[PDB]
Write a protein that binds this ligand. Structure first.
Ligand SMILES: CC(C)[C@H](NC(=O)[C@H](C)NC(=O)OCc1ccccc1)C(=O)N[C@@H](Cc1ccccc1)[C@@H](O)[C@H](O)[C@H](Cc1ccccc1)NC(=O)[C@@H](NC(=O)[C@H](C)NC(=O)OCc1ccccc1)C(C)C
Ligand SMILES: Cc1ccc(S(=O)(=O)NC(=O)Nc2nccs2)cc1
Ligand SMILES: Cc1ccc(S(=O)(=O)NC(=O)Nc2nccs2)cc1
Lengths: 99, 99
């Protein structure tokens, strides 16, 4: 769509044959999702934000669908309290900020 | 104008006399800038994200220019490593996500 920001920009995502809600985030370099089993091998990673760092597992070339828009790319899993769609995936669905 | 997301969506702001860069951040509720000098009476406030939380200072009715769009709102001030423009001002300047 064209989505307003009066309300948080949380959309429906599909990943792993599971439906989740996530936040379209121009403030995130990377896509980080709450704890979930996922296929293939991973590598260790840290991400930072407000008030420090946390550890995550990087998985590559993952199929995700975001309001019906398919993308394959990197997805990180760990103790985020919010499912976040970051720029690496927002680009793949054509997402822009406009005003 | 249009901001595609291949790089961090950075923009020029003008606030309390000064020129700065700040990130347009759709997953930020509030606006939060690096330590600076704003006027008069402020209240404590707590904001958190990945990894933890910070203590900030809340300044209300602060005037700000964001990419030539004027806005008046709550600016938060504290130890964030990046200046963040949140939905509180993104809404005032007519900012939406398009895909
Ligand atoms: C989502 C992350 C992957 C993202 N991180 C990155 O992309 C980082 C910079 N990149 C990165 O880590 O890459 C690898 C790296 C980096 C540096 C060194 C080595 C390796 C990030 O945290 N980005 C944040 C900005 C930032 C950048 C640098 C440093 C510090 C902060 C926000 O823009 C991003 O949009 C998040 C989303 C979020 C929110 C909550 C939990 C988890 C994620 N918002 C926030 O952190 C904001 N918090 C909020 O908006 C919350 C929801 N509000 C809040 O506390 O409100 C009051 C409240 C109080 C009490 C209860 C409830 C609410 C903040 C900017 C205002
Ligand atoms: C676009 C899109 C379709 C379907 C999903 S799904 O139902 O969550 N799971 C999968 O497709 N898994 C996979 N199948 C083959 C390789 S990875 C997610 C995203
Ligand atoms: C459009 C635009 C003009 C001027 C500015 S300014 O010089 O940075 N600030 C102000 O003039 N006044 C205030 N700042 C804080 C409270 S009242 C900012 C934006």
């Amino acid at each position: 769509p064209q989505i307003t920001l009066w309300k948080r920009p949380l959309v429906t995502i599909k990943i792993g044959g599971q439906l989740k809600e996530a936040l379209l985030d121009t403030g995130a370099d990377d896509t980080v999702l709450e704890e979930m089993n996922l296929p293939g091998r991973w590598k260790p990673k840290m991400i930072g934000g407000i008030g420090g760092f946390i550890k995550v597992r990087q998985y590559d070339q993952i199929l995700i669908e975001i309001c019906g828009h398919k993308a394959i790319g990197t997805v990180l899993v760990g103790p985020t309290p919010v499912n976040i769609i970051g720029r690496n995936l927002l680009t793949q669905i054509g997402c822009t900020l406009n005003f």
